[PDB]
Amino acid sequence: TTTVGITLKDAVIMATERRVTMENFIMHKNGKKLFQIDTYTGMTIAGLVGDAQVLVRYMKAELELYRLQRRVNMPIEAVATLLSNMLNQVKYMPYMVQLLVGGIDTAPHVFSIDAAGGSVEDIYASTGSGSPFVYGVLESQYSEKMTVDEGVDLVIRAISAAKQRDSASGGMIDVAVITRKDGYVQLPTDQIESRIRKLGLIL
Amino acid sequence: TTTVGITLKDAVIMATERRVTMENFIMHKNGKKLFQIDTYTGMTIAGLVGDAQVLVRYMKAELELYRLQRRVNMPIEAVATLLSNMLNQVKYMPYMVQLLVGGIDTAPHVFSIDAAGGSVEDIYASTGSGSPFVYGVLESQYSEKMTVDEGVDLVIRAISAAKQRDSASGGMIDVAVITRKDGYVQLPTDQIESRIRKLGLIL
Amino acid sequence: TTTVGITLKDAVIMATERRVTMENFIMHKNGKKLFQIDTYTGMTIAGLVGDAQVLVRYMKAELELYRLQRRVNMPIEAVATLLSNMLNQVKYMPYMVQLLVGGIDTAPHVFSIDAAGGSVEDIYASTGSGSPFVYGVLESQYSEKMTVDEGVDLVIRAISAAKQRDSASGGMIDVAVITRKDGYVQLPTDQIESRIRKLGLIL
Amino acid sequence: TTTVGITLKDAVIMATERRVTMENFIMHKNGKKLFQIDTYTGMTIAGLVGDAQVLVRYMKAELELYRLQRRVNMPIEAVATLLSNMLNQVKYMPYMVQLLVGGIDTAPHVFSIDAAGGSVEDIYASTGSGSPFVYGVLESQYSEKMTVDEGVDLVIRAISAAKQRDSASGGMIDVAVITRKDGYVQLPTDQIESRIRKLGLIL
Amino acid sequence: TVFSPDGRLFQVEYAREAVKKGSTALGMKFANGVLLISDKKVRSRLIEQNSIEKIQLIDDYVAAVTSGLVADARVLVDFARISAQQEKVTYGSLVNIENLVKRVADQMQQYTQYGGVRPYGVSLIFAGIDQIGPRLFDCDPAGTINEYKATAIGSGKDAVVSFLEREYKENLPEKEAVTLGIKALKSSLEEGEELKAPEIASITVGNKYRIYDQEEVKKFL
Amino acid sequence: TVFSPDGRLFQVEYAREAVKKGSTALGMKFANGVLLISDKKVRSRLIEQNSIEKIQLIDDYVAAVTSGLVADARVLVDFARISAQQEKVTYGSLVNIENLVKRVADQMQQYTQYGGVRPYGVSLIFAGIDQIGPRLFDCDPAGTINEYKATAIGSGKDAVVSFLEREYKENLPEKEAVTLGIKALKSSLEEGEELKAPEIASITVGNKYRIYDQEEVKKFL
Amino acid sequence: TVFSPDGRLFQVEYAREAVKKGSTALGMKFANGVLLISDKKVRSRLIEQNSIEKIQLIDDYVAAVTSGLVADARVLVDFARISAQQEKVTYGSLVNIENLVKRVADQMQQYTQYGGVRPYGVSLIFAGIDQIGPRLFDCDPAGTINEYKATAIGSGKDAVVSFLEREYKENLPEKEAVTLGIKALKSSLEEGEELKAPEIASITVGNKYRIYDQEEVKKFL
Amino acid sequence: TVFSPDGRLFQVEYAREAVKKGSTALGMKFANGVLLISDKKVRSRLIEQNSIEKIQLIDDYVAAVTSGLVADARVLVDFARISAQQEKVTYGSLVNIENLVKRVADQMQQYTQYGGVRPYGVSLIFAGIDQIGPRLFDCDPAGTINEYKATAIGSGKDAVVSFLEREYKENLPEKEAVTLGIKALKSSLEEGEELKAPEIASITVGNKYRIYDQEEVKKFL
Amino acid sequence: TVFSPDGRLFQVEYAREAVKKGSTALGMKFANGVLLISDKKVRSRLIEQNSIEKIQLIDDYVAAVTSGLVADARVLVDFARISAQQEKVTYGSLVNIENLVKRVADQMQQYTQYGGVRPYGVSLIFAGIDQIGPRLFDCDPAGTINEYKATAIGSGKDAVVSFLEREYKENLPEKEAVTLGIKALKSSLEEGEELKAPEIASITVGNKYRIYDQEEVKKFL
């Protein structure tokens, strides 16, 4: 699994690969690991699949019911605190996942949540098994002054560099850009294939 | 993790580093491990992250509800006794943390609380993995006649000396000074960088 | 840990050291392990710290509520029987402590209570890890005809001899003398330092 | 531990030593292991101490409440059957003891009860760790035609012979003689010391 | 069981009306000791007199005499026995009789609030020896405790109490206190009725609880 | 079930009114033994006489005869049997019959407090041999126990008790006590009614419980 | 317990009618300390005066005096003691007496909503020393708390309060406040009645709770 | 609590009759802030004025003023505090005050269906600062919520509301809104009554909750 | 809630009498879409108009308008929201709105059998888009569901329904259906009353739920 979250000024760029693997065996070449939880909020799952899908359904219900009962979207620290309280109440019969929550609430935020409920905000985060290769690219090429398109090209370079050296990562890259003006925008396959083919990458 | 509490006359100085690590791997270079629980009271967490954050949320609720119901802040021995009763009621499905509670209740106090609920008051305490290096500095350089600024410089020297020799400790130092006159004062980043750069330290 | 109880005619002398240790590491150089449970009754804890502090709070509540409901202090055999029934009701999720209860109820008594609830009365008892050195001193120098001051000097010699040869024992010695005339009297630090310095001991 | 029960015509002689030991270490040189449960009935405990003391308190309550509700003392087979039903209802979270019950109900009886509730009546029984030495003396010197004083001298010889060769047995011997005429009679220390010194024994 | 506009509980008053139809009983403190005296009006010759016990033992130091409905009295005596043995298991001995009386009376009070249960129609007298010495108590169907020195319960309460605030003096011996209690019990009866042998029980400080046999009572008549 | 202003429980009084419509039954203590006699008025010729049991065994040492509502009587006999077997499992034997009667009567008392249940309309007579020897008991729908020497329950109680306080003497043999009980049961009937064969059961000390067969009863008529 | 069309709870009003028949009690704050005074009308010479406690201790810093039905008062004092010891176990000390009063009064309020239980007919006065110093409270059978400086409960409440809004001044010493409370308690009585020795209890800031002995009260008369 | 043939709930109407006997209270929204004003009619000189709190804090951003029965008001304020802290534990902060009011009012509605419990006789006013800014709410014993801009509860509600639909204007400063609320509270009183010092509390957007001290209120009179 | 001899449930009839006092509401199906119109009679100028929501959203595809008691309406809307989110968690999407209405109405039916609870005095109108397209439902306090094409609930139901069985035609556009609903809502009012701005909400097939803003409604007047 490979999972990236990038905070830029007025923007959150989150992206993944799509491979589902059974111990060495590529069971599914097109998974879905990047979800829209709320209008300005997306989470991204890694780890076991069934636990993570249950968490996605539950958080879509909780955030939509919150939005209906309160007339304004849930803040991102409250989303991450809600997942922290949920994941920590079991702790011994645990959900074996790790999650990223990214969104806009007059400030872009990326929260990284582990299997026991420790939510930590950071300017860029990455979960999965291909995580250290992404962290290797983002230690050397990330800058907080980048535009949105340089951010998308950076995350495509990071996940491509993780796909070259991790065997549990691969497939098409799903990128989603979250802004206040346009909202949660799932970038199309054609633009991502154009950026992959343009930057000199064969995926 | 590295965590210091210092009792001076009319003052409590508590401080930490900021690194969150997964077994050798620096997951987050800016955590938050020093919290304000009450107007004159701060705790400081070490150990597992999700358990410690749940304890922080619970103790903020308990101390604020106590303050509203009783019109006067909770004494520090009652805060530490409340954490002792809370942590000891599980004891077998335990919270795997260790905590410091420091505050002013017409006397400065620092309580050290372990994972099973044994609260012991001491004039200076230190929790975390970088704990013995801090205890090495504080055995040789602590004096009860110090001023507040000599105390802040001492805790900066202790956490810097722990950051040099522990790999699970690092990052920016968060210092908070608790007095009766000014209250809980989180010292700014610029003053701490000025004291680090002034004392001859590169962090 | 080192813990002594001595029965003399019309007197009970109980005393401890003050060191709290984490496997080789002196976490706290001033603990509190000698408590006053009732007006003529004191217990003394050894073992795990959080369990023992919970037992101290519970027994203070039970003996004070007994004294209010019944207009006369609880007999010492009933205190030890109450701790025996309490510690034995768990027995499998146990409190891992060992306790001494000493008091005056028209006869001086010292009861030794283990982690499973076996209360045995004896004329002198000692718990902790430095227990056999105390038993070595008390086998050769205890006499039932001693005065109170010879008793206090004896317990200071016993705990000093345990501090020389046990690494988990150390610190200042807390001595408390329980009589019918004066009650529970915690002896001051100055008198104990005077008796330590007078008998030729460096602590 | 060493524990003897002897049935003679119109008499039951039960006796013990008094040592309480922690794995090699003589914690208490004067325990109490021979108890009076009812006016004509005494039990005798061996094994773990706290479990056995809880069993003594419970059986004193049950036999006294039986005597008040029914105007006549409980038969000995019903005492042993009551302990058998009590000890067997746990069986997996067990009381780790072994017990003797002796008494007069127009016939002298000695019942031996183990940790799982198997009560067997016998003419002489012995529990504890020094049990086989007592059984060695009683196989060769017991006779059913003995008087009460020859019985007391026999049990003193048996427990002395167990004290010579078992390290977990020792101390003063407590002998109690149960008859219909005199009842439960705890023999004094002076008579037992006179019989020990008279028979040529140093204890 | 609700309040009357006068501020009264009617089921408790009617329970006291059920108490006023029981056998007359006395409790008298004498010099280091307590007496309990109960009337034993066995009407038929067919009732076995070997097992009519009016003075119930709760402990070999503590006894009680009941009046009112006899079935609720048997229930409260059984609860008092189980509570006494719980105090002996938990603590080791029974230091104060007053808290045994408070546990029985807090059982009796609880049925004077809850709507799904009627009050007990029983008044009790407790008596015994504890560390404060000889103690005597009276318990009222509302759950009301009063520590006394001489008292009566039952049908002829007012004649006996009216006798014992003019004829009772403090530190009597045992035989004089028994004789005073017997002539009190005769003062409760109207003429035509002679006392058949009542039941008398005594305890002194240090000893256990001694119940008088038959010919000693007939000598004390 | 609440108190009347007189201090009375009305459901217990009405339950006793339900008891006064049952079959007449006797219990008589004789020289080391107990008798139970019950009337067996089988009206129709169509009722099977092979299995009409009026004297129920609770134990092969302990029996009971009931009166009142027969369904509540069957329930109380089943509870008495289960309680007797619990005492045999827990202790090993049944030392006192009185505590079996106290467990049944403390079952019967409990329905005279709680509002969601009516009292039992059954009076019982217990009888048997324990370590105190031959014992005979009577249990009243309030839950009231009285140990007796001769008693009756049912419709014709007062004629039988009024016969047995002028015709009963203490240490009769078995045949004389059966003959006295049969003429007591005839003294309960008015003229026009002849006794069809009643049911008689006896126990002596040491032996088990012996129920009389048919031709012995017809000889005893 | 339902609403009246006037907007009233009738069982609470009738409970206050039950409170108006209790013994008169005072609480007075003096200069760093609190007084509690209770009347001790022992009528019979047969009531033991060694153990009549009108001023109950809940803690060696906190005491309470009750009025109304004495059995419900005993229940509420036992609940107050258990709640005080729960606060000492959980926290370590008792920082505020007001929350002890709020736990007792939230026990008393709960029975004024639920239909299966009647309200408590008890008014209480709490008093003691905490970190805010000397504090005095009054608790009403609806569960209503009022912090006071001088108050009375019981039968003669209005005479004592009417005396203490014309005769009470703020920072009295201990002896002057006791003398003022005693003449207040005399002002409640009508003529013909003389005070037999009442019960007075005091606490000052820093010390524990001191209950006056007998001859000091008779000197203070 | 059942329906009337008119389609009415009578216990809710009678609960509103219990609400009409409380102290008069105001809530006023001013320019980025909320006011709560409560009347403090302390009658006796013996009531301690240091701890009479009419304006209860639920949060250092959220306060409420109650009217009606004061014990049920204390219960609902404690439930509001525990619910506020549950929202802070679960989510991290209190984003909307309206759902706190909906949890309190859904507690109050639940007792207007179930038959074993009476409704609360309390009307509340909530007030505070959330992400939608200054918000003011009113809660009716049926459990009915209305968001307002100026309101009153209690005895003199109609005089204050009738004053505030002719004298209230939208974006007042703080001092003008306090002065308008004080003359509204004077408009509720009849002649002969002068205001002793009421309790005024205010909050502005960004700051915490500020309760006025004594001499500022006496200056604002 | 029991049967009348006519075969009627009286608490349901009285609950409908409570429904006849609510605000008038319309639901109208137009060409691929549903309308909900509610009257917004805000009387005082002090009620905040920013948060008076008469048309509640249960889902961004499904909305409901309530009439009757507003507190029970808030409870039923909260139950409808939680039930909708349970169907989204369990299945993944909300395929049929009719089963959401059946879960709400089977909650409302359950209180019309059990004796310890009164019925809901609320009638609801559900509306939304599912796989069968635009659907409109009405729910009656007995728990009775009827799928409609145009309906009204509240006080002026019969004037609006009587208007819409002579003025309603099937496949109107959105603006014509809103104009017809507004003149229906004017047909419910008597003279003297002018419509202040009501609340109108619409959904079309494929889109989400669109609530009209203020100046569009004032243009539609």
Descriptive report:
Chains E, F, G, H, I: Keywords: Cytoplasm, Proteasome. Chains E, F, G, H, I: Belongs to the peptidase T1A family. The structure is cut from a larger assembly and holds 4 copies of chain A (203 residues) and 5 copies of chain E (221 residues). Chain A has 203 residues and is α+β, with helices and mostly antiparallel strands. Chain A has a single domain (1-203), classed as Glutamine Phosphoribosylpyrophosphate, subunit 1, domain 1 (4-Layer Sandwich). Chain A is 36% helix and 32% strand. Chain A has helices spanning 49-70, 76-88, 131-141, 148-165, 189-198, and strands at 2-8, 11-16, 20-22, 25-28, 34-38, 41-47, 97-104, 108-113, 119-121, 124-128, 174-179, 183-186. In chain A, the strands form 3 sheets. In chain A, strands 10-1-2-11-12 form a 5-stranded antiparallel β-sheet, covered by helices on one side. In chain A, strands 5-6-7-8-9 form a 5-stranded antiparallel β-sheet, with helices on one face. The longest helix of chain A is centred in the first third of the chain and has 22 residues, at 49-70. With 221 residues, chain E is of the alpha+beta class. Chain E has one domain: Aminohydrolase, N-terminal nucleophile (Ntn) domain (Glutamine Phosphoribosylpyrophosphate, subunit 1, domain 1, 4-Layer Sandwich), CATH 3.60.20.10. Chain E is built from 6 helices and 10 strands, in the order H-E-E-E-E-H-H-E-E-E-E-H-H-E-E-H. In chain E, the strands form 2 sheets. In chain E, strands 8-1-2-9-10 form a 5-stranded antiparallel β-sheet. A 5-stranded antiparallel β-sheet of chain E has the order 3-4-5-6-7. In chain E, helix 2 (70-91) crosses helix 3 (98-110) and helix 4 crosses helix 5. The longest helix of chain E has 22 residues, at 70-91. Chains in contact: A-B, A-H, A-I, B-C, B-G, B-H, C-D, C-E, C-G, D-E, D-F, E-F, E-G, G-H, H-I.
